[PDB]
Amino acid sequence: QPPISQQVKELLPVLAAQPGHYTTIHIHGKPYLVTEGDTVKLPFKMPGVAPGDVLRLNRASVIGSRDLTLQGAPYVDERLFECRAIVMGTESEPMRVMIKKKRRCRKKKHVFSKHKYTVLRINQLKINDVSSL
């Protein structure tokens, strides 16, 4: 695979050594700035997942600490970090009714929308040691 830049290889340990780290994961192109322990409530029902399933997130746009920020051009290389989630089931919204109507017209058309949302939990967010790489 493409070798990592030498500048990223000398400052990644300085990034992993700081107290806290965050990341911007991309699920289907949409970003979510999260940290280990956060609960992501996606605006869609992920198909084919049950509670207890583990997802490995591999498209991260930004991984940074307080002072240092690691940016990938399209995305950061998967070898640098390791992010994992866990499916905590799906939740729903209260049914909302949309009334489409025009003036001086008695016909009121109703639209009932009640969508489901998958909830995740970032249970792992660690930066790898790339000394061997």
Partner: protein
């Protein structure tokens, strides 16, 4: 070559003949891409809607499953561990961890065939009163 036509604008207020030109090209909604061979018949068809479309010469025609795969975003995740689930038409698929790779689906008419722990298995585990962990491990 081929003409790659994309309906950039609409024709909501243009004459009815302009809708007949967009119907022959196949442009129903906005930003819809069609591929038509480079020919005089199509070329004169684009000179009538040249204020609404964007034309481009492409070597090969793209299939329906390839025009949509260029706007498809990367999933951004990979299922590495699945928990036991019941598939209605297949059976009871056991747990699989793709990190060490096994979708074994056991179906039958008895609990033993499904591969789950039954009441009898709990009676055999309850009578094993001699099993003991090694002192070093305790």
């Amino acid at each position: 070559s081929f003409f790659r036509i994309t309906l950039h604008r609409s024709a909501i207020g243009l004459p009815k003949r302009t809708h007949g030109v967009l119907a022959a090209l196949g442009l129903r909604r906005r930003n819809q891409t069609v591929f038509h061979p480079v020919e005089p018949q199509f070329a004169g068809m684009l000179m009538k809607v040249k204020e609404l479309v964007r034309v481009e010469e492409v070597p090969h025609r793209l299939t329906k499953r390839e025009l949509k795969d260029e706007r498809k975003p990367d999933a951004g995740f990979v299922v590495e561990k699945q928990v036991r689930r019941f598939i209605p038409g297949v059976g009871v698929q056991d747990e699989v961890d793709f990190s060490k790779v096994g979708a074994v689906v056991r179906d039958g008419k008895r609990a033993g065939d499904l591969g789950v722990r039954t009441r009898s298995d709990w009676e055999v585990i309850g009578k094993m009163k001699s099993v003991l962990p090694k002192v070093k491990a305790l």
